Amino acid sequence: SRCTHLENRDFVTGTQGTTRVTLVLELGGCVTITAEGKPSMDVWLDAIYQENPAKTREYCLHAKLSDTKVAARCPTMGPATLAEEHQGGTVCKRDQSDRGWGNHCGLFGKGSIVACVKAACEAKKKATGHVYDANKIVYTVKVEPHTGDYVAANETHSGRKTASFTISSEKTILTMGEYGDVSLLCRVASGVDLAQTVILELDKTVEHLPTAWQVHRDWFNDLALPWKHEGAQNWNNAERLVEFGAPHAVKMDVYNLGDQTGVLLKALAGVPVAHIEGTKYHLKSGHVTCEVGLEKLKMKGLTYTMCDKTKFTWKRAPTDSGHDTVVMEVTFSGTKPCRIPVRAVAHGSPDVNVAMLITPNPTIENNGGGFIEMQLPPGDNIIYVGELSHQWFQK
Amino acid sequence: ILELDKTVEHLPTAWQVHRDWFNDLALPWKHEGAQNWNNAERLVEFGAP
Amino acid sequence: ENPAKTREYCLHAKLSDTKVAARCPTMGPATLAEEHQGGTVCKRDQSDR
Amino acid sequence: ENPAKTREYCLHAKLSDTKVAARCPTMGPATLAEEHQGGTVCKRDQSDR
């Protein structure tokens, strides 16, 4: 059962008459649903994402400066000017330098000086923000029936089904193989509010970093870095990463404040990560409430005869699942298919069956069955699968 | 005298800093000539397994 | 000219050859030869199995 | 019959292939490949030179 793979697992149980079940599925969680006369089902919210979300601003973390130009005039010669002062994509500073005979001016005094640099951004040194549209966000829910077959996490359960939901398409009917149909009504509106969320992306090809972060819109909009719209050619406020030195005669130095990535990363510690897979921008945390309709589900193998009580052996002896249940797997050497005669008694009371089965109507099919998950009361018990027995101390 | 990469064009080639400040930098360090870095973990983080 | 160098600090780590070793609950401690080599950064922890 | 074995302890160590590496005061850290191998016991110290 898929839910046995994780630590975060909930059990939902429907009694007599319970045909519908309302669950709050959370990313990283898993729910096992059990109900009288119904095959058990594992359900979980698998992903929350939007393909190609809209991009808000792009910020530059490392300025690439080039073509530094300086123009200086002697004290009586008027303002110094450069064509660059009027071009976008350049950062300039006008100042005054001390001039005199030493640097070829007729008078000793203040002379006009102006320096400009072309400012661009280093390749792969942008920080881009993305915003979600509640109407385009997709919630993916997976359902897997309890078939008495154990499948590891790196393996694929042939009976697992997937359902996708958007605000405009909240209901799906899934056919669970021979178990019947299950209906899922999940409301995206009951999900995570995304108004103040921005998915921040740096360079997703960097190997030792998460591919994205989920940050607050107000924090993102206040970053003190050069910015522009995707598609725009030049950067606004490029001066944020450039400093000019005090001028001396006909020269003025231009300083680059360096790569701000390290600075940003310190700010991002403790911020939740997100994930990008191609064009899909995923949230790594979130939840949604769904209504599961069980009325069309039917159990499998109810009319088989009981398996020969003499032909069972333990493939995997009873073991603690970590969810206060016991898991085990048996092998049957008799004729299939048949119902597995499972029960358990408390040490000293051989007459009362104390086993509460999670796995519905355990059966050995022609090519499956054998895995059983059950709950037992605290203390010493003995598990029986026909004549096959096993001691079990619960707790 | 602190030196970074003196070949970088838009930066001073060196700074005059206080010895106590320099000795307290929270960065991996080593002696010139040494092959490995001490305290390299200062620039590395491990995720929950 | 050529003043004596004190420490060198690293401003940007270059990481490579990430290796992981994990053992099931009854199989004892996980170990890597790298844990004993200089020039490597390691973290030992516990995962749910 | 054949109960499970927990730890094995060693009551008498068999030591062999003692190796020492020493460096003068300006030559940096002394190192041995053995410091990184399992199955060796090492001690780093400082001697008067």
Automatic annotation (TrEMBL), chain A:
Positions of transmembrane segments: none
Top-level taxon in the UniProt lineage: Viruses
Disulfide bonds: 3-30, 60-121, 74-105, 92-116, 186-290, 307-338
Name of the protein in question: Polyprotein
